[PDB]
Design a protein around this ligand. Structure first.
Ligand SMILES: Nc1ncnc2c1ncn2[C@@H]1O[C@H](CSCC[C@H](N)C(=O)O)[C@@H](O)[C@H]1O
Ligand SMILES: Nc1ncnc2c1ncn2[C@@H]1O[C@H](CSCC[C@H](N)C(=O)O)[C@@H](O)[C@H]1O
Lengths: 291, 193, 291, 193
DNA sequence: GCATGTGTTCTAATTAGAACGCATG
DNA sequence: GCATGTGTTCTAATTAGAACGCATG
């Protein structure tokens, strides 16, 4: 573990987020009260960047596509106290029968995280604190999970969002964060049941919903694919504001860029369960300034 | 990396991956005895090799990476060899303090596509050099080399076009080239003969 | 000509809203601070009702299509202290070349407001206060404006939303509200310039935008139909949250019912300029309970 | 409306709109022959008539409305005649305390469509009654009547086939029809003859 | 003097939805 | 012991945009 840091010696956190998505990392960090000195986000989706900048008013330095981040970039933008990211899982998750592993297609982008991580690592003789974390799906080939752990020299911790959210989301988490293996516990404001996430005059058919993907079909529950919501005595699909509350995002977090339903679900389906990331970053507020 | 006096050049300690270079290296005088456990360590499959392995395999002076010679002979994706090579390479580099010269090289037998090529140069922090072995009557054998050997990226090679290289690969469907590639190595370690 | 009412004698307001749309009236009244005792809304658009119910958590009694409201209904639901409504203008506004006028198509729905207004009027000998207001477009055949004034026995005051908003919206207002002809004055919280309504990292090309209709073409400004927003040095159209701010609605007021861009502009296109309605309802605070 | 003894039945003060029935009322014996000059007011274009105009014209015992007979004389939209009739009808109602019987009737010469008819009944708070005015050997006249005259809604007129009446209008392409529905008013007002 | 507008419409892009997929608790 | 899944694809519904319109300050 790292040595505790006297409060006064603590400085703001400098975060390098690769594949930032909709800036979930920055969100949890700010909701935790941690002073964010610098948040360098590597993201290529126009709408994703739009949400991050608009919802956080330009505090995120968007660099670009991760493969064009150089060694000099890491030292100019650095130093970094936290390096986080989750690579695209379209070629790793078992939901796609045509996945291409992590050595072809988009799975390769994992090694960019591995590459930029070692660049960000403090050189020998620099005992300053440094934390990193990598997220990805559980439904990946055992060979891929093996190799990933090989390159990161660490074994993942599986955390299912069901304990703190109203949805199924089982994900592996590599990293060195303090107390990742600790038992996860629910909070007061954690929306644990679908009815807590719905709008007024809507009834929830289930306590929990199945793992949410980019596609609207994952909103229909079970083998029958029934609608999860009833309102006005008519069956209906989830709403975008409700999807956001399921993931723990602020309501209307993805009301940006004139995005419709497919767009907002696409961004939310690939994101992190906010409460899970909060559980992971929680012990960080003992190493950095808070305000 | 400064030059080494001939009398303090100790025998080289090399780590060979995916390809056994014992024959090529010994032919140029780098291994002293018929049995040289310290001189060269060879691994073909690294999927389960950890840093503690390389660390304990004894410090290394050279780390050689090579792709399978051109043929339908490898089940693994071409990028796998480079990613794994880069993974162990970071394991083999000694402490930041430089006690002796540390070298590394990675050769591709015209197996990596342009996508794999750009990822390769990005991860190895340099554009590759091309090693052509052509005597006019033949232009068949060639390989790409990423290496920090100063003489491997200082001398001028027979600069040949990419389409010409693509044609050579389609036509294909080391002794002279890789040896010329390696000669600058024995200016740094013991010459055994 | 309204008898002043001391505060203790004041009781909450009972409002009958016909063609309620997205419950602008209720929004204005509640933002003013008036206790809304009862808000009976006659609306037939599902998404419109979805906004009113969800955004106001069921305080609005939806009845239905106005033509099925009976004299008995007005007596049961009543008494009403305020009757407000704006009839559809698709067959009255000059923007539609094939409009059918006040006596055919949709224009005749005006008379329903007239009809129910007389049902709601206090009977002879009922000195109790009673206010009403009717809104519609300025671009209307003189004969229609004439006849409307004839049936309502009142002449309309025209108020253009530009004085208090960032958009051209000139509308006639028939009614008996206290001080409708008073000078329209801006507030310190009125967003008078388009730049005030835009999101972060968005530049407004214009100070004011033209009258916003249901179709997305009214966002392209001027004869050249230029885009009104520059973002990251690129032309872009207004956003739903920006349209909402232009009108004075709370941001995300129409992030409802999985509605997209076309749907949300369609509801906002026929809505009222909130600050205008606020200027009209303001003197009601001196006739009904407030809290 | 209780009955009024014969010796207290004043002459009618009729307001006639869109159509003049001075000949019909005089024939049946409700209107004096000597010029009042007018115990019956008639207006054709009401677009600019205000409440104080109807009030000024003296209390009205009956308010008559009628669509234009079948033809191309339909200058204005059909619904205009009803909305305007309803508008002036409210102006003519006396104070809530009813000193005398107040009657109204609105007649349509098979001009309004069903979409128009339901608005008519909704605004007149009554379903219309159809006048067959068709002998066994003649079915010429036919009209619809909304009216609060008790007799007009009390007894049984000759039922008709709606499809047939619509067919009579397409084929077209007065006393028995309406004047027969006017006689019951004699009970309430003075009879001149 | 000429741009403006609480819209309908017809067509070209565009989206939603289901078929597809199977190793694994 | 079946149900499940940070997804791609192909089609069938839809959605967006421009032509249309002209009395009027
Ligand atoms: N080459 C690249 N460089 C940087 N980002 C990329 C990239 N290719 C894909 N991405 C982005 O990486 C993201 C991975 S999905 C993960 C999103 C993020 N973890 C969240 O919480 O929302 C996607 O949004 C995708 O747009
Ligand atoms: N027959 C009918 N009965 C009740 N409402 C109707 C109706 N026909 C149309 N409407 C509704 O009347 C509204 C007129 S547009 C006016 C909306 C409202 N003034 C606002 O501020 O938003 C439309 O939303 C339309 O859906």
């Amino acid at each position: 573990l790292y040595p505790a840091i006297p409060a006064a010696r603590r400085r703001p956190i400098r975060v390098l987020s690769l594949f930032d998505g909709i800036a979930t990392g920055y969100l949890v960090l700010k909701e935790l009260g941690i002073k964010v000195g610098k948040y360098v986000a590597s993201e290529v989706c126009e709408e994703s960047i739009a949400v991050g900048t608009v919802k956080h008013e330009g505090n995120i330095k968007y660099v670009n596509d991760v493969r064009n981040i150089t060694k000099k970039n890491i030292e100019e933008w650095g130093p970094f106290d936290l390096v986080i990211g989750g690579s695209p899982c379209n070629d790793l998750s078992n939901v796609n029968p045509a996945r291409k592993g992590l050595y072809e297609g988009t799975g390769r982008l994992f090694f960019e995280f591995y590459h930029l991580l070692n660049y960000s690592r403090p050189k020998e003789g620099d005992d300053r604190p440094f934390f990193w974390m990598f997220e990805n799906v559980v439904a990946m080939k055992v060979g891929d999970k093996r190799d990933i752990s090989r390159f990161l020299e660490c074994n993942p911790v599986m955390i299912d969002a069901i304990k703190v959210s109203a949805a199924h989301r089982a994900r592996y988490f590599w990293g060195n964060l303090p107390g990742m293996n600790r038992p996860v516990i629910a909070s007061k404001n954690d929306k644990l049941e679908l009815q807590d996430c719905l709008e007024y005059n809507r009834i929830a058919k289930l306590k929990k919903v199945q793992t949410i993907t980019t596609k609207s079909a994952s909103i229909k529950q079970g083998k029958n694919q029934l609608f999860p919501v009833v309102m006005n005595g008519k069956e209906d699909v989830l709403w975008c504001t409700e999807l956001e509350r399921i993931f723990g995002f602020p309501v209307h977090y993805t009301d940006v860029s004139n995005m419709g339903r497919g767009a907002r679900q696409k961004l939310l389906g690939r994101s992190w369960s906010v409460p899970v990331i909060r559980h992971l970053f929680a012990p960080l507020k003992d190493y950095f300034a808070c305000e | 990396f400064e030059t080494v006096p001939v009398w303090r050049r100790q025998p080289v300690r090399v780590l060979s991956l995916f390809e056994d270079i014992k024959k090529e290296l010994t032919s140029l005088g780098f291994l002293e005895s018929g049995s040289d456990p310290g001189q060269l360590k060879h691994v073909v499959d690294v999927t389960d090799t950890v840093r503690k392995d390389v660390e304990e395999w004894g410090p290394f002076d050279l780390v050689y990476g090579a792709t399978p010679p051109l043929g339908h002979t490898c089940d693994r994706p071409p990028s796998w060899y480079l990613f794994q090579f880069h993974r162990l390479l970071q394991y083999a580099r000694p402490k930041p303090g430089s006690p002796r010269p540390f070298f590394w090289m990675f050769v591709d037998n015209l197996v990596l596509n342009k996508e794999d090529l750009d990822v390769a140069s990005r991860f190895l922090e340099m554009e590759p050099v091309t090693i052509p072995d052509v005597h006019g009557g033949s232009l068949q054998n060639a390989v790409r080399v990423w290496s920090n050997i100063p003489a491997i990226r200082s001398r001028h090679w027979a600069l040949v076009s990419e389409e010409e290289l693509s044609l050579l690969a389609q036509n294909k469907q080391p002794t002279k080239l890789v040896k010329n590639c390696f000669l600058p190595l024995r200016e740094y370690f013991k010459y055994f003969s």
